[PDB]
Design a protein around this ligand. Structure first.
Ligand SMILES: O=C(NCC(=O)N1CCCCC1)Nc1ccc2nnsc2c1
Ligand SMILES: O=C(NCC(=O)N1CCCCC1)Nc1ccc2nnsc2c1
Ligand SMILES: [Cl-]
Lengths: 306, 306
């Protein structure tokens, strides 16, 4: 019973978080085997960030300028390099708490957990999604850069996000663990604006299935629709177009509940056109789009990790 | 920037979770030093739960009937006793991952993190509150009993909740770690209904302060009010009466923002009487009441743990 925004257990990632200080900046790094990964803007002053030439700034840095601390103990840096927008600091000790892991570049609409950290110490954990405009709506303050996002599968941590920037609109931008930004964003203090923050239709529908599983049923109607008919309504409300691939992904939830996907689309259609009339669904007064189909099955299933 | 429902890092608690099986029931236990704590209904069959006599059922149990597993290794049970609604299983090995900890019985309105587990393995983490009717709105399936709720302060885990029951209405009931239920609930499969699920007024006001800190300002008005005037409106909307003690707790957020608490009460009053007119606050279309004042300061502050 019940449905909550649920993050993955964070312990496997907590054991990888370190502090990285270069000259005057301190942020977080990720220690996996004998490499510490962090944002390359650790090498910049606040002034540098208006027009940084990272290769030039890096030339004035040596291994011993990167002060890396795992809890109370210092790590010895024996090499460094820049890969896209991250630095890889080779250290002389493999992290003994390195979990089984992979680096993944996620697609928009996918969800992940964030372990917010400051000065190398974990502060909290919450659940995000990669938005269709390639921002995330996180909770990050100064000093949180280098905090990571991840998913877990059985005993493997798939790292998908590293936090680098806050846009002037208060949303967040960052990279995969190869250091390539999601979307068009850059690690410069400049005018970069987010595009339309469209709604992840397949996730809304998954959440509606979660609601039915839990007794919230008032929005089910006698109607059905078609993909093309539904998508005229999605367009008007700045929803992603629903594809047959989405329908196929919702197959398991459809079979579990006996509600055809297109029937659920017709319920969503009525919700978009008429609103919720002051009612709630799973404790929400709006249509939630940061649960994936897999998220719903998992929470409705009890899937565990190690 | 940003405000999220944020749980504590779960690693310190993950290291304490074990599996407890008695005869035919398997749920979760909490391993701290050389004691494993779990719900006493691990000793019951599904049939027993309609009218269990726990002392009588316990007489037919010995140490070796309690099969306790921490990951893949078996723990040896060398004594057992019942304390209120929990069992304490003495084992012959102190948990090497025992964090610094305390047991606390929380008051309604306080928040905590839940580490949902199945078969001794962590599944996810989320943020709850103790409701004024002494339920919690969690996400628990069969097998999650024994999962715990906790807060962290510096390096100390304060355990406050153990999960025992699901009410027929889909909300959740449980105990502190001394085994005393929150509220009037019992570990019997019977008619126990929840009282009024009132709203935690001081938490709504804290969240409104969080919203102002973050740029969400449209609900600020030119009005003020008094405690007694505001509370006539709280009563009508099934809000907790606001006390001077609540006002004093909101002092830090008031000082940070320069908005007098009673001015914020007048904004909340207008929100209760007029609604949100289809607008949102911090991504929500309703008035959120599961952030405490301390929660807001913490997330708006960057407070870290170890
Ligand atoms: O350097 C910035 N902040 C200060 C800082 O923590 N460091 C700067 C030195 C390098 C690493 C650490 N840049 C920034 C922040 C928020 C923004 N919101 N809109 S533009 C924008 C730019
Ligand atoms: O025993 C129940 N469930 C089955 C079970 O997991 N075990 C029973 C044996 C002892 C431990 C494990 N009781 C219950 C559940 C949900 C309810 N919702 N409303 S009443 C109500 C009663
Ligand atoms: Cl909402």
């Amino acid at each position: 019973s019940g449905f909550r925004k649920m993050a993955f257990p964070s312990g496997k990632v907590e054991g990888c978080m370190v502090q990285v200080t270069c000259g005057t900046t301190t942020l977080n790094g990720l220690w996996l085997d004998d490499v510490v990964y962090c944002p390359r803007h650790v090498i910049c002053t606040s002034e540098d960030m208006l027009n940084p030439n990272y290769e030039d700034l890096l030339i004035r840095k040596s291994n011993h300028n990167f002060l890396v601390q795992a809890g109370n103990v210092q790590l010895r840096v024996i090499g460094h390099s820049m890969q896209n927008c991250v630095l890889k600091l080779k250290v002389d000790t493999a992290n003994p708490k390195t979990p089984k892991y992979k680096f993944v570049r996620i697609q928009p609409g996918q969800t992940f957990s964030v372990l917010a950290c400051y000065n190398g110490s974990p502060s909290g954990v919450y659940q995000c999604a990669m938005r269709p405009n390639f921002t995330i709506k996180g909770s990050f303050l100064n000093g949180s850069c280098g905090s990571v996002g991840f998913n877990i599968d059985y005993d493997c941590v798939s790292f998908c996000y590293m936090h680098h920037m806050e846009l002037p609109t208060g949303v967040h931008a960052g990279t995969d663990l190869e250091g390539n930004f999601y979307g068009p964003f850059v690690d410069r203090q400049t005018a970069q604006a987010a595009g339309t923050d469209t709604t992840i239709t397949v996730n809304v529908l998954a959440w509606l299935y979660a609601a039915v599983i839990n007794g919230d049923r008032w929005f089910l109607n006698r109607f059905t629709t078609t993909l093309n008919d539904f998508n005229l309504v999605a367009m008007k409300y700045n929803y992603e177009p629903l594809t047959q691939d989405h329908v196929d992904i919702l197959g398991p939830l459809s079979a579990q509940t006996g509600i055809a996907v297109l029937d659920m689309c017709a319920s969503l259609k009525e919700l978009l056109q008429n609103g919720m009339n002051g009612r709630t669904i799973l404790g929400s007064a709006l249509l939630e789009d940061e649960f994936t189909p897999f998220d719903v099955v998992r929470q409705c299933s009890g899937v565990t990790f190690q």
